[model samples]
Target chain A: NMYVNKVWVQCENENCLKWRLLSSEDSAKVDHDEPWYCFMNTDSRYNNCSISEED
Target chain B: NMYVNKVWVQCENENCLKWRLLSSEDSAKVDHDEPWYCFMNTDSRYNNCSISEED
Candidate 1:
């Protein structure tokens, strides 16, 4: 069975912040770390989004 | 280039389900089959979060 333990994310900015992947459950446990979650106008679109790209 | 599979996901809400391509080779045959093998969070970010709107 497949399961997710961590979720990595990079800020959509020139100097994007690299965030560690963590479940919402674990995210809360860590006290809402910065770059963990943010609210940018159009950025909200990324809230529940996924895609394919190269690093 | 492209790589992924029927790996659609939209757990946020309202049946956000959409399958993405997969390169994990029989993700099902393998146990903990999230992928044949995780390419690490940083590398696979696109597999989950698409940057391009067209993606």
Candidate 2:
């Protein structure tokens, strides 16, 4: 899910600082997924949001 | 807090592409709030990631 200032993936560790993806499919199915990791603008911050993969 | 191909915040006046994070209590807390800009791949493409929020 997205947060106040950035995107966040479940971490690989308890602290979650590792910040790893829940599953390969999850990331693979992003844009097709709800809210989209790259283009989340369902809040006030939406005015400044977009979607873009590694390019 | 990540760089390279993508994952960059701190925009506003600059041309930050506008990628936003949906706010939640979790995002509100964060990894105790540090450099915890999400567990990013220290290097190289970590290959697709995951998360959820909004909608």
Candidate 3:
């Protein structure tokens, strides 16, 4: 029963304005307003993207 | 030292399928294979969506 509101994200790649929604399941609780690290690179552990919560 | 690889999420509304990378901050650790609840409705705490991790 733990969850948040909206989530926002941005890539570190310059001109990579593709903040696309990858997935949104039904579980886990999180701070919607807190910023989150996002990485789309499957082989790289480093985060190349960032995300936040929305109302 | 607490974080996951990738996250997956989905909305409850039909045809509202949107799996985006909301965040990837250098914080919080999670199971990459587990499912996460996601809600973009803001005020409503009910998980309207879900998410998971990768890598």
Candidate 4:
């Protein structure tokens, strides 16, 4: 079976403090086995979200 | 919750055809969420098992 895990993604830009779940679909597309740390677009030029396994 | 995936491991040495499960303990230690393919020890100097996600 193909199982999945959860990781957290939070917007770093003070303007957008929204926290979101890194969905399975997105994770599968990236398909990284090991935990990852990166940034993603938050639909605004001013900010991007920070993604991490820590929280 | 941390979930897991199953993969198949079989001996390809022709002489020793055996199948085994790469248990959760081992898998968690390796911590690869995506499908994996590789080889592992089978206790014999002559042969090792091939691990794959295909079956």
Residue A25 of candidate 2: its Cα lDDT? 38
Residue pairs with colliding backbones in model 2 are A1-B51, A1-B52, A2-B22, A3-B21, A3-B22, A19-B39, A38-A50, A38-A51
Tens digits of per-residue lDDT for model 2 on B1-55?
2211223221132322233332343234434444333233232232113322112
lDDT of each: 0.34, 0.30, 0.36, 0.40
Instruction: Find the 10 residues in a row with the least total lDDT in model 2 chain A.
Output: A46-55
How high a TM-score does candidate 4 get? 0.22
Q: Return the candidate ranking by TM-score, descending.
A: 1, 4, 3, 2
**Candidate number that wins on lDDT, 3 or 4:** 4
Mind giving the per-residue lDDT tens digits that candidate 2 earns over A1-55? 2223234342222322233222333444445433333222233332222322211
Docking class of 4: incorrect
Worst 10 residues of 1 chain B by lDDT: B1-10
Give one digit per residue, the lDDT tens place, for model 3 in A1-55: 1233323344435644434332233112323454333454221432354433222
- List runs of model 3 lying over 4 Å from the truth: A1-55, B24-55
Report the Cα lDDT for candidate 1.
Answer: 0.34
Better of 1 and 2 by TM-score: 1
